Amino acid sequence: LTGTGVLTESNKKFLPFQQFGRDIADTTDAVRDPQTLEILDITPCSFGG
Amino acid sequence: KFNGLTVLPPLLTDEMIAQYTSALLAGTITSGWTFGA
Amino acid sequence: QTRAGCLIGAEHVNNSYECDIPIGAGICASYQSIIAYTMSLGVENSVAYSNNSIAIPTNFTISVTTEILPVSMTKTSVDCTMYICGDSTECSNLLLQYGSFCTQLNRALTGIAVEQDKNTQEVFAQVKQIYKT
Amino acid sequence: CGDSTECSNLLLQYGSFCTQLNRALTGIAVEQDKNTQEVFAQVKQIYKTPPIKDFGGFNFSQILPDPSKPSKRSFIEDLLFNKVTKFNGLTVLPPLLTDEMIAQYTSALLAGTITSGWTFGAGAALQIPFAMQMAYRFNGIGVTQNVLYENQKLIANQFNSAIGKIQDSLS
Amino acid sequence: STASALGKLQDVVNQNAQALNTLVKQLSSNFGAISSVLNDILSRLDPPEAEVQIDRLITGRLQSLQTYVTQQLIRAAEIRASANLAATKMSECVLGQSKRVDFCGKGYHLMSFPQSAPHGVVFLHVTYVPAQEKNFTTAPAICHDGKAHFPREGVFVSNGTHWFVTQRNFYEPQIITTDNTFVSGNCDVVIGIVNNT
Amino acid sequence: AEVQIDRLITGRLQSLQTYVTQQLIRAAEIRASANLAATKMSECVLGQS
Numbered sequence: 001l002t003g004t005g006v007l008t009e010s011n012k013k014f015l016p017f018q019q020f021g022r023d024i025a026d027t028t029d030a031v032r033d034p035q036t037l038e039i040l041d042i043t044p045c046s047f048g049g
Numbered sequence: 050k051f052n053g054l055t056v057l058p059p060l061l062t063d064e065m066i067a068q069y070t071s072a073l074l075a076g077t078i079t080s081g082w083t084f085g086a
Numbered sequence: 087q088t089r090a091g092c093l094i095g096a097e098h099v100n101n102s103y104e105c106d107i108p109i110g111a112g113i114c115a116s117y118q119s120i121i122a123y124t125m126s127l128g129v130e131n132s133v134a135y136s137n138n139s140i141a142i143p144t145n146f147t148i149s150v151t152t153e154i155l156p157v158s159m160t161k162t163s164v165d166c167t168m169y170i171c172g173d174s175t176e177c178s179n180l181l182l183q184y185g186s187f188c189t190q191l192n193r194a195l196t197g198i199a200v201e202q203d204k205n206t207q208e209v210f211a212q213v214k215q216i217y218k219t
Numbered sequence: 220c221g222d223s224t225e226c227s228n229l230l231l232q233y234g235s236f237c238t239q240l241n242r243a244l245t246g247i248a249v250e251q252d253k254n255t256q257e258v259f260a261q262v263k264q265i266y267k268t269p270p271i272k273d274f275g276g277f278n279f280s281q282i283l284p285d286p287s288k289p290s291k292r293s294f295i296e297d298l299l300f301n302k303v304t305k306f307n308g309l310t311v312l313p314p315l316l317t318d319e320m321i322a323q324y325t326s327a328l329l330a331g332t333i334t335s336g337w338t339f340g341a342g343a344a345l346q347i348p349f350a351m352q353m354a355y356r357f358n359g360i361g362v363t364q365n366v367l368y369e370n371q372k373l374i375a376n377q378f379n380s381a382i383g384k385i386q387d388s389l390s
Numbered sequence: 391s392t393a394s395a396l397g398k399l400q401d402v403v404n405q406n407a408q409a410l411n412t413l414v415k416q417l418s419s420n421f422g423a424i425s426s427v428l429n430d431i432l433s434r435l436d437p438p439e440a441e442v443q444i445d446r447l448i449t450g451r452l453q454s455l456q457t458y459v460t461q462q463l464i465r466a467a468e469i470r471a472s473a474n475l476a477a478t479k480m481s482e483c484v485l486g487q488s489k490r491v492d493f494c495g496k497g498y499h500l501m502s503f504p505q506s507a508p509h510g511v512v513f514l515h516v517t518y519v520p521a522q523e524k525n526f527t528t529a530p531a532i533c534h535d536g537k538a539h540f541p542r543e544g545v546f547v548s549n550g551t552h553w554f555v556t557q558r559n560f561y562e563p564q565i566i567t568t569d570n571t572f573v574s575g576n577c578d579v580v581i582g583i584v585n586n587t
Numbered sequence: 588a589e590v591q592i593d594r595l596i597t598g599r600l601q602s603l604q605t606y607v608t609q610q611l612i613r614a615a616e617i618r619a620s621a622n623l624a625a626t627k628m629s630e631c632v633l634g635q636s
C-alpha cells in the first residue's frame with residue numbers, strides 16, 4: 001500500500017483480521033503497521049492555490 | 050480537500066446576512082415603503 | 087392492462103380520488119391492498135349565475151403564507167495535476183502535450199464562483215443604511 | 220451493446236456514466252409533468268356554465284365545450300388540434316395528463332372567468348352579471364362605465380365579428 | 391413540527407454532494423487499462439508500453455472532469471435564473487405593495503417579510519381573503535325624474551324592498567344620494583333600469 | 588476483437604453524451620417558456636393587467 005501523507009495516532013478499533021480501512025469513495029483512511037500491529041491514521045498533507 | 054478539490058468560503062458571512070434581513074424588516078415596519086425610494 | 091403497460095399486484099376500482107402516486111395516462115395508484123384508479127380533478131360545483139344577482143362578502147380573514155427560493159450554491163475549485171496525475175512526473179509529461187485544457191476548466195469554475203457571490207450580493211443588498219428598531 | 224455479453228463486460232469498467240445519463244433523462248422527463256401541472260392546475264374546483272345562455276348579447280358558443288363531440292372540445296380546439304401534425308433501446312413515455320383532463324381544466328377556467336370575473340382567483344367564486352363585469356373592466360382603463368351602457372349592442376356585434384374573423388383566419 | 395417543507399434547498403445540497411461524490415468515485419475506474427493505480431503499472435511495466443495505459447487513464451479522467459464541469463455550468467445557470475426571480479420578488483413585494491395577481495401569495499396582497507435560509511430566502515406573505523357572502527339583487531343604473539344615475543364607486547344592491555350603494559369588496563350599505571352618484575342622459579338606452587328615488 | 592469493441596463503445600458513448608447535453612439545453616429553454624406562459628395565464632386570465 002503506497003502513498004503520501006502525514007501519519008498520526010488513531011483510536012479506531014480494527015477486528016483482528018483486517019489490515020487497513022477506508023471511509024467512502026474507496027480512499028484509504030487508516031492503516032495498521034505489520035510489525036507493531038497498531039492503528040495509524042493517514043491525512044493528506046496541506047496543499048492549496 | 051482530499052485529492053485536489055477545494056471549497057471556497059462565501060464572501061458574505063451569515064451574521065451580515067442576518068443584519069441585512071434585520072435592517073430590511075425594521076425599515077419596512079417603521080417607515081413602510083418610503084424607505085425604498 | 088393500461089395505456090402505459092400493465093400493473094401486477096394492484097386491483098382496479100371504479101372510484102376516483104386525488105391520488106398521490108402517479109402512474110400515467112391518467113391512471114394512478116394508492117394504498118388505502120394497493121389499488122389503482124383514475125385521478126379526479128376536483129369537486130365540481132355550478133355557480134348560480136343570473137342576470138340580476140351578485141355575491142358580496144360580509145366578513146374577511148387574514149392568512150400568512152410562506153415560500154422558499156434558493157439563491158446560491160457552494161463555490162468549488164478543482165486542480166488538475168493533483169487529480170489526473172496524482173503527483174507523478176511521467177503523467178505530468180504526458181499531460182503536457184494535450185495543449186491547454188485545464189485553463190478553460192479553471193476559468194469556468196472561477197466564473198461561476200464569482201457569479202455566486204455577485205448573485206447573493208444583488209439579492210440581499212437592497213438598502214443603503216442599517217436601520218434599527 | 221445490444222445483447223452482447225462481451226460488450227457489457229467491457230463496458231462494466233468504464234465507470235458510472237450510464238447511471239448519470241439515465242438520471243438526467245428521468246429528471247427532464249419529470250420536469251415536463253411539473254410544467255404542465257404548474258401552468259394548468261390553477262383552480263381548486265371545477266366550475267360549469269348554467270344551461271341558460273344569456274350573457275348580455277355576447278356569444279361564446281365557439282369557445283365553450285360542445286357535449287356533442289366525444290372529446291368535449293370546442294370548435295377552435297378542434298381546429299388547432301387538426302392544424303398540428305422503431306425500437307432500438309429507446310422508448311417514449313406517455314404524459315401523465317391526457318387531453319381530456321387538460322380540456323376540462325380549460326373549460327373550468329373559461330366558465331369561472333365568465334360568471335364570476337376575477338373573484339374566483341382570490342377566494343370563492345362570486346356571481347355577477349357579465350354586462351356589469353365588462354363595465355367594471357372599462358372603469359379600470361380610464362374610461363367611465365357610462366360608455367358601455369350606451370353602446371352595448373355595438374360592442375357585442377364587434378366582439379362577435381372579431382371572434383368569427385379569428386375562427387376564419389385559423390381555419 | 392412538519393418536515394419536508396424545505397425540499398428545494400435540501401435537493402440542491404444533495405445534488406451538489408452527489409456530484410462531488412461520484413466525481414471522486416470515478417478515480418477507481420479502470421477505463422480498459424491494466425490497473426487503476428499509476429504506481430503499480432509504472433513499477434510493473436517499462437515505459438514503452440506503460441505509456442499506453444497512462445494515456446488511457448488520462449483520457450478517461452479528462453472526460454469525466456469535462457462532464458462534471460458541464461453539469462456544474464448547467465446547475466449554475468438554473469440557480470442564477472432562480473435567484474434573479476427571488477431578487478425581483480424582494481424588490482417588488484417587500485419594498486412596496488404589489489398589484490399583479492398571484493405574484494405574492496393567494497388573495498389581495500398586503501405586505502411581506504423576508505427571512506434567511508442556509509442557501510436561500512424565505513418570504514412570508516400577509517394577504518386578505520373575503521368570506522361570508524350573500525346574494526342580494528342588482529341593477530346597473532337607476533332612473534329618477536327621467537334621467538339615469540350611475541354609482542361613482544360601488545354597486546347597487548337591494549335587500550328585497552330598499553336599494554343601497556355599497557363597495558365591491560365589503561358589504562356596507564348607504565342611502566342613495568346625489569353625492570355618490572352621477573347623471574348621464576335619460577333612461578331609455580340602458581338595459582336593466584329600475585324605478586326608484 | 589477487443590480493440591474494435593472499444594472503438595465502437597467509445598464512439599457510441601460520445602454520441603450519446605452529445606445527445607443528452609442537447610436534450611438538457613432544450614429542456615431548460617422549454618422550462619423557461621413554460622414559466623412565462625404560467626405567469627401570463629396567472630396575470631391576464633385571472634385579472635386585468
Ligand SMILES: *[C@@H]1O[C@H](CO)[C@@H](O[C@@H]2O[C@H](CO)[C@@H](O)[C@H](O)[C@H]2NC(C)=O)[C@H](O)[C@H]1NC(C)=O
Pocket residue numbers: 034035036037
Ligand atoms: C514483529 O516485530 C518484532 C520483531 O522483532 C517483534 O515485536 C517486538 O520485538 C521487540 C524486539 O524484537 C521486543 O522487544 C518486543 O517486546 C516485541 N513486541 C511484541 C508485542 O512482541 C515480534 O517478532 C513481532 N511483533 C508483533 C507485535 O507481531
Ligand SMILES: *[C@@H]1O[C@H](CO)[C@@H](O[C@@H]2O[C@H](CO)[C@@H](O)[C@H](O)[C@H]2NC(C)=O)[C@H](O)[C@H]1NC(C)=O
Pocket residue numbers: 131132133134523524525
Ligand atoms: C343564492 O341564490 C341561489 C339560487 O339563485 C341559491 O341556491 C343555490 O344554487 C346553486 C346553483 O343552482 C346551488 O349549487 C346551491 O346549492 C344552491 N344553494 C342552496 C340550495 O342552498 C343560493 O343558496 C343562494 N345563496 C348563495 C350564497 O349562493
Ligand SMILES: *[C@@H]1O[C@H](CO)[C@@H](O[C@@H]2O[C@H](CO)[C@@H](O)[C@H](O)[C@H]2NC(C)=O)[C@H](O)[C@H]1NC(C)=O
Pocket residue numbers: 144145146
Ligand atoms: C368575522 O369572523 C371572525 C372570525 O371568525 C368573527 O370573530 C369571532 O366571533 C365569534 C362570535 O362573536 C367569537 O366567538 C370569536 O372569538 C371571534 N373570533 C375572533 C378571532 O375574535 C367575527 O364575528 C366575524 N364577523 C361577523 C360580522 O360575524
Ligand SMILES: *[C@@H]1O[C@H](CO)[C@@H](O[C@@H]2O[C@H](CO)[C@@H](O)[C@H](O)[C@H]2NC(C)=O)[C@H](O)[C@H]1NC(C)=O
Pocket residue numbers: 278279280281
Ligand atoms: C352564436 O354563434 C353561432 C355560430 O354562428 C350561432 O350558431 C349558428 O346559428 C344559426 C342559426 O340557428 C345556424 O344557421 C348556424 O348553422 C349556426 N352555426 C353553427 C356553427 O352552429 C349561434 O346561433 C349564435 N348564438 C347566438 C345567441 O347568437
Ligand SMILES: *[C@@H]1O[C@H](CO)[C@@H](O[C@@H]2O[C@H](CO)[C@@H](O)[C@H](O)[C@H]2NC(C)=O)[C@H](O)[C@H]1NC(C)=O
Pocket residue numbers: 549550551552
Ligand atoms: C332592508 O333594509 C332596510 C334598511 O334598514 C329595512 O328598513 C328598516 O328595517 C328596520 C328593521 O328591519 C325597521 O325597523 C325599519 O322600520 C325599516 N325602515 C324602512 C323605511 O323600511 C328593511 O326592513 C329591510 N328589508 C328586509 C326585507 O330586510
Ligand SMILES: *[C@@H]1O[C@H](CO)[C@@H](O[C@@H]2O[C@H](CO)[C@@H](O)[C@H](O)[C@H]2NC(C)=O)[C@H](O)[C@H]1NC(C)=O
Pocket residue numbers: 137138581582
Ligand atoms: C334577465 O333574464 C330574465 C330571464 O330571461 C328576463 O326576463 C324575461 O324578460 C323578457 C322581456 O321582458 C320576457 O319576455 C320574459 O318573459 C322574461 N322571463 C322571465 C322568466 O321573467 C329579464 O328581462 C332579464 N333582465 C334584463 C334583460 O335586464
Ligand SMILES: *[C@@H]1O[C@H](CO)[C@@H](O[C@@H]2O[C@H](CO)[C@@H](O)[C@H](O)[C@H]2NC(C)=O)[C@H](O)[C@H]1NC(C)=O
Pocket residue numbers: 583584585
Ligand atoms: C318608471 O316610471 C316611469 C314614469 O312614471 C314610467 O313611464 C311611464 O309610466 C306610465 C305609468 O305606468 C305609463 O303609462 C307610460 O307608458 C310610461 N312611459 C314609458 C315611456 O315607459 C315607467 O314605465 C316606469 N318603469 C318601471 C319599470 O316601473
Ligand SMILES: *[C@@H]1O[C@H](CO)[C@@H](O)[C@H](O)[C@H]1NC(C)=O
Pocket residue numbers: 099100
Ligand atoms: C365497475 O366495476 C366493475 C368490476 O368491478 C366493472 O365491470 C364495471 O365496468 C365498472 N363500472 C361500472 C359503471 O359498473
